């Protein structure tokens, strides 16, 4: 979702001129319109807490009750009070402060070869609860462009059209 | 009407012996692909109408069997095709789950080529429709699952020939 | 035709044809001179009856021809008018057969399976035949327009 339909060129201008911090840039990307259209409108209140804990706080959901406990902040205060409460936890301010971009904290053990399945792959933008509603299809009854003569594109075994660009090469040459 | 387990039990029973290591060796091979066949039969059930719409438009949609005089001209005759192609895509799904093509010749193949000759249905265009239908089925279920579902399509095409 | 199903009716009942059946085969063949004149009018008016038929069809259903419609582009629109030429032809058969038996087993039996399987809106093709009906009945007198229109609306009924 890094498209120039989703770039925020005025948030970027206020970061270059030292007006906002990175904590305000990270807040402005969650409250942005591309994030509400592509992510918030295809999750329920419980899976969206899992997305914003994994991407803002940098760590995984503890259990299925942490999802329940935080999803009522979105339903009663809206999305703007939920990201103020998340950014003002001491888990955030001890790790990233207001000047560091978040990251997935302690994903891989120092001597191992594998990791812990990075969080953009663990939770994509919609899941099983919205799969049976917005999933695409194959063979959609959609009336596409036609082809009209399919056996002339790939001939069969005794067809002399397989020897047609061989008469040009030999010629009287 | 036997699946892979029924065929394994029959051959092991027809000699009156128990299920030795070789009989269970194939049964374990069938249970390993049990997860693949259901998902293959899952998506085929979903895109049944879409697959048949793709095959006829890709193989015999605009050929002169579709035009007047061709074998598929009238709307009753055209409607019989997609009804007819539905069985091939459906019974092939059953063979893909059962892992044994016994159901095809039991319920599809016998008296089939002898029936199309009676009606005058072109067996040549029929097989190419199933071949094109086999080609789109490999699109949905993947490569190896398409290899499995494709293994029963040409079984129909072979016997129907 | 009226001759073939008045037979197969009395055929099934193990009997011959009644006066009610034979005074209508009689009444139909004396009607045969007037039927060929009516079908002769629609025969060499297919250029206007079809092209003006698809005239009102697109003005009333621009979705089917707009981008995304089933009959979009130079290609499908040609086939979009091809089917109207078919159904206009079957109405000429029904007028000469004195029944929709030719239209029944051609273009009507299982028609919803075809058009549903082609992605075509079956309601849209029904709108096309209605537009042809107003052009056809505008080409004939009142005594004839009660027939030529009469076979179209049967096709309208079975096509939905």
């Amino acid at each position: 979702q890094i498209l120039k339909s989703t770039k925020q060129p005025f948030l970027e201008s206020q970061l270059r001129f030292n007006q906002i911090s990175i904590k305000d840039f990270i807040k402005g990307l969650v409250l942005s319109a591309p994030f509400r259209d592509l992510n918030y409108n295809v999750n329920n209140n419980y899976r969206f807490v899992e997305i914003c804990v994994q991407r803002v706080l940098g760590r995984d959901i503890y259990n299925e009750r942490e999802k329940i406990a935080w999803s009522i902040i979105i339903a009663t205060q809206g999305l703007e009070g939920f990201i103020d409460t998340l950014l003002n936890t001491q888990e955030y301010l001890s790790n990233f402060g207001d000047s560091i971009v978040p990251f997935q904290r302690r994903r891989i053990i120092p001597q191992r070869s594998k990791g812990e399945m990075p969080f953009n792959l663990k939770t994509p933008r919609y899941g099983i609860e919205f799969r049976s509603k917005l999933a695409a299809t194959q063979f959609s009854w959609a009336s596409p462009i036609r082809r009209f003569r399919p056996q002339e594109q790939q001939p069969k075994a005794g067809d002399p059209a397989l020897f047609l660009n061989m008469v040009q090469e030999m010629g009287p040459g | 009407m036997q699946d892979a387990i029924t065929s394994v039990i029959n051959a092991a029973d027809v000699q009156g012996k128990y299920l030795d290591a070789n009989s269970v060796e194939k049964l374990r091979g069938y249970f390993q692909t049990g997860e693949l066949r259901v998902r293959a039969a899952a998506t085929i059930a979903a895109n049944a109408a879409t697959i048949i719409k793709e095959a006829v438009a890709k193989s015999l949609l605009y050929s002169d069997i579709t035009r007047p005089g061709g074998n598929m001209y009238t709307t009753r005759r055209y409607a019989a095709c997609i009804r007819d192609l539905d069985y091939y895509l459906r019974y092939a799904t059953y063979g893909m789950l059962a892992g044994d093509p016994s159901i095809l010749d039991e319920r599809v193949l016998n008296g089939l080529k002898e029936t199309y000759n009676s009606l005058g249905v072109p067996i040549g265009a029929t097989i190419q429709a199933i071949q094109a239908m086999k080609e789109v089925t490999g699109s949905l279920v993947g490569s190896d699952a398409g290899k499995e579902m494709g293994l029963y399509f040409d079984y129909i095409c072979s016997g129907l020939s | 035709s009226i001759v073939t199903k008045s037979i197969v009716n009395a055929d099934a009942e193990a009997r011959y044809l009644s006066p009610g059946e034979l005074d209508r085969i009689k009444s139909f063949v004396l009607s045969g001179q007037r039927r060929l004149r009516i079908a002769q009018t629609l025969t060499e008016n297919r250029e206007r009856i079809v092209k003006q038929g698809g005239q009102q069809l697109f003005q009333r259903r621009p979705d089917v021809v707009s981008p995304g419609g089933n009959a979009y582009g130079e290609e499908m629109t040609a086939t979009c008018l091809r089917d109207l030429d078919y159904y206009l032809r079957l109405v000429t058969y029904g007028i000469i057969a004195g029944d929709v038996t030719p239209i029944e087993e051609i273009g009507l039996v299982g028609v919803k399976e075809m058009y549903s399987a082609l992605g075509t809106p079956i309601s849209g093709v029904a709108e096309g035949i209605r537009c042809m009906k107003d052009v056809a009945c505008s080409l004939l007198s009142g005594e004839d327009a009660a027939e030529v229109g009469f076979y179209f609306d049967y096709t309208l009924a079975a096509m939905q």
């Binding site: 003569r149 399919p150 056996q151 002339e152 594109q153 001939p155 | 015999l60 050929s63 002169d64 069997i65 035009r67 005089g69 061709g70 074998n71 598929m72 001209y73 009238t74 009753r76 005759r77 009606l119 005058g120 072109p122 040549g124 265009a125 190419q128 | 058969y93 057969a97 038996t101 030719p102 029944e104 087993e105 051609i106």
Partner: peptide, 22 residues
């Protein structure tokens, strides 16, 4: 056997044969 029915001879149709260029 009906108002539309098939006979082999009236079939003028490259579909029993399959030269796909027509």
């Amino acid at each position: 056997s009906g108002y539309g029915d098939y006979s082999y001879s009236t079939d003028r149709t490259k579909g029993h044969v399959n030269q796909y260029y027509v």
